[PDB]
Every structure is written in structure tokens, then in C-alpha cells.
Amino acid sequence: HMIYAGVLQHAYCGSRKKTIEHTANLLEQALKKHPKTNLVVLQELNPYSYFCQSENPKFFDLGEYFEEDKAFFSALAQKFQVVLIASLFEKRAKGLYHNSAVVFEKDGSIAGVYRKMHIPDDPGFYEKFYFTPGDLGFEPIITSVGKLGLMVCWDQWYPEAARIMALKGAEILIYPSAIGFLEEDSNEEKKRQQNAWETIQRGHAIANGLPLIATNRVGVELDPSGAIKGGITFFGSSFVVGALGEFLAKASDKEEILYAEIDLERTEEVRRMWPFLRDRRIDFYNDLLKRYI
């Protein structure tokens, strides 16, 4: 059981149409450069700007594309016969939206949908205004390349989420992300932010004996409201680690096709060496259900 993973890390191209066409070109390039690729993961909200930089209800208009986006990325997955993970903007109902990652099987059928569960809220990342927190919970998505523990961005800071996926048979953890720095940040803070983002996810891999893919976009994006001067600089640096937290591939902070070959069969050997799941003291984990004590 092998996953030959491709990560398409790029900038927003100024419109939805141009951006999704650019992603389609990179997918084609990725499959020529790496013909064994059976899983392609896109960045969070891959057709769009990171529109949560400001709190503005006009951006809910972008929710009207969900079915067209799925048709577009469904066709891509079937055309290139890969499992494809897109990160989309789901309109659940009038006035009701989710940050929803969609997994396309290699025949274009939808293997599953994950609604972002943990929703952030900081200046420049006003996601709680737009995204209703997911209500399906932490459920892996079964695909022809394995049972995918798929979550989105802010979810990656929560060990609880990765553990629940692992307990439900996930064979890999995957997080399309949108993370960048502000003009105000010092070099020390940027390095610490990015290193902590990498480190916490490497811990999910180690704790669960599972490999992990994290994707991210690149490029400077300016605040249309003008509140945040210098906008957000997305640092890319998508990466893949194995079941011991060891790096399998690491990207630059520029546009990049990242490739890694992931052996799922190592999970048995890693968990035999480190049987964390055997030893979890679930009889004393009840306090995890509390906000604070």
C-alpha cells in the first residue's frame, strides 16, 4: 500500500477562473513530472483569495460556486485518474456556509466531504464570521488509495482531531492550509510561527503512527478593506512526514509541485515499536470533554 502524493502549492491568480485553470495546468504538469502520482492535495480554499482577511458579507457570493467547483475538480480527477482533494466553500443553505474539503475518487465520484471543525478568529483571519463549524465530526474518508484522515487548516493545531481520525482507521493525516505572516512580524516570530506549525503536525504523525501531508498557498494578498497594511504573506512550505515525524518532502515558499512517496505499511511496524494506542489511559480521558477545569 503506497501513496504517491502530489501537492500543488501556488498563489491565487486574481480571479476564480484563472486560479482554477492554473491549478489544472499544475496538475497536468505534476502528473507528467511524477507519473506514479495517485493522490493530489490542493491548498485550502484553492479557487479563491483568502477572503477571511476582512469581515465582509459580500464574500458569501463566492459560496454560489460550490457545485461548479466540484464539477470542475471532479472532471480533473477523472481526466488524470487520481484521487484529488479540493478545499472548497460550501453553501449549506441560504445564509449557512462551511469550509468544506471534497475528495474526488479517480473516476470523478465524490468519495467524501469534510467540514472544517475548528474555526479560527483573529484580525486578518475572521473565519468564524463566514464558516459555520462542521457538524459531521472527525470522520475519515475512504478512497482507493487509503482511508484519509482529512481535516482543514486550523484543525491541524488540535491533537484531539488527529487522534479521533486515527481511532477511526485513518491511514494518513491531511491538512490543506492557508497560513502566512503579517508585515508587522519579525524574522524571529516568522521562523517560530512556521516551525511551530510544522512541529505540532509532526507530533500528530508520531502520536498516531501515521504519515501526514500539510499543504499551503504562497504569495502576498492584500486586504481589500485596507485595514491590514501589507496584507498576508503566505509562506508555502507544504510538507510531508512519515509515521515517526521524519520529513519525506519539504517545499520552498514559492510556487511548487511537491512530491513524496508514502509507505502506509510502515504504520504496523511503527506501532509495534511504539504501541501508544494500546496504552492510552482512556479510563482517565473524560476531562478532555471540558472547556476548562
Added chain:
Amino acid sequence: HHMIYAGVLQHAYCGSRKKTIEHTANLLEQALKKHPKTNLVVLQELNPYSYFCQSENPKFFDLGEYFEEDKAFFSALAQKFQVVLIASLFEKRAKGLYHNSAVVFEKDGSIAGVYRKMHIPDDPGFYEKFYFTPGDLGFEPIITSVGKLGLMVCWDQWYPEAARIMALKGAEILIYPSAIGFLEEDSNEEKKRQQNAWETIQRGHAIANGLPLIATNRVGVELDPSGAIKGGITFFGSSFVVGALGEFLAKASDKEEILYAEIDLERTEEVRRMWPFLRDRRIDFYNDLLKRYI
């Protein structure tokens, strides 16, 4: 202000209980002369003893008879140097019943609290489930004059759940006396990956909870007295301290070492304002954490 001036005593087993604890006392004295501000000293796991779980032999339960003498010895040390002191001891709770128990001594030598190791490993050369009954007190921080200590022991440090529960109960720092080493069979790549994973997962506890973290470890080669494991265990030291962003504040060698770190607990406020993970935890969908597997 609210500062912890932390000292870690990383050393080898000295061939006997008596020599080892006296060696710890001498190192503690050296540490306080070099770092006079020290208000917290953390020892290595099972600090008076060899890592006797390398083999499964019921005679080592005889070591459980020293618990009160060990507590008296390290109580007197904490009182002599007026530091909060964390020892990692071997508790005989009753006939046939033992725990891996870390004990916290207040600066006056009184016992601030006791933590019984919760997660008990069982791997060749690490036969801990044979000796240690799993803790029954749970994950409770221990209140001391230098802060609320989220104290756990060794194998506990691989479990984000335990660190989280401590943080939810107001721990201001996470602390793990450990005993971790490599076997002669391990390649250099495997040895490097093991040690890096051990550090990395603990840095994640610090990040996830916005709390600083201390990890301690012993050094030295210790041979299997039964002869089953050729080459024994080489404990790689590398005690370390990280802050609430996962950043290293101090990192030790693989030799005997007094490691010192100044830890600002007040940083937790600014870190959690920046990274409000606790506000956003989806506790309404965490129920499945209570299952063995699903």
C-alpha cells in the same frame, strides 16, 4: 514577574542506590552554587536506581522498600537548598502493589504532591507493566510555591491527552522525568529518528497548550543483568526545556550535565491570546477520544 529558575540534574546511575543519591546531592549542591536563583530542580526518572525494567525479575520489588527513606532523603535536600524538588521514586503502595511515583517537595521539604505514572510501557528491555501498577489518581497538577506543576513521568510524554488535561486543570508548566535510550541493534538513522521524535512530540504539547515544558533524562550505558539484551541500553541524556511556543530555551548534551533555564510563566497569557486553541476546541465532538479504537 512569575519566573521559574529550573535546574535539571542529568547523570548516570552510580552502581548503588547510596552512591547515586549522594551523587545527585553533590550535583544539586553544584547547581545551586552555579545558579543561585534556582527555585525548581527536576531529577531524572527513577533517579536513585538503575533502569531496572530492562529485565523482568521480581527481586527488583525489593527496591520498593526504600520509598520512605528516599522521600526523607530528597525532602531533606529540598529543605537544605530551599528549592522545589521533583524526585522520581518507586512506591510500594501495599504488598504486591507498586507504582512509578514522582514526588514534589516544597522548599520546606514538605510533600506538595505525588504523581503515579499513568501510561505504563511494555517493550523488550522496557518491561514496565510487570512492575508498575498504572496510576489511579489521574492527571492532576501539583500546586507549589513556584507554580502549578503539570508533572507526569516518561512514557506519559507521548500522549497529547495527558498534557491537555493538565493544561485544562491550570498547569503552568509541563514536566517529564524520563529514562530513554537506544539499543545496540539500532542504526544511527533510527537512533536519530527516535530522539528527534521524543523531543518533537513534547514540543507539540507545549505548543498545543501554550505552556513551557521540561523533559529530563539520564545518561550512561546500562547492561541487562539477565544478559538477554546484548549491549544494554545507552541513555542519551539530551534533557531540554522549551517555552510556550515550542521554542528551545535550553538543551543538554548526552553526558552528565546540570541544565539551567529561566522560564517566564507570564508568557502564557500573550501566547494564548495569539493562539487561542483552548477557546476553539470542539469539545462537543471529542467524545470518541474515550474509545480504545473505532
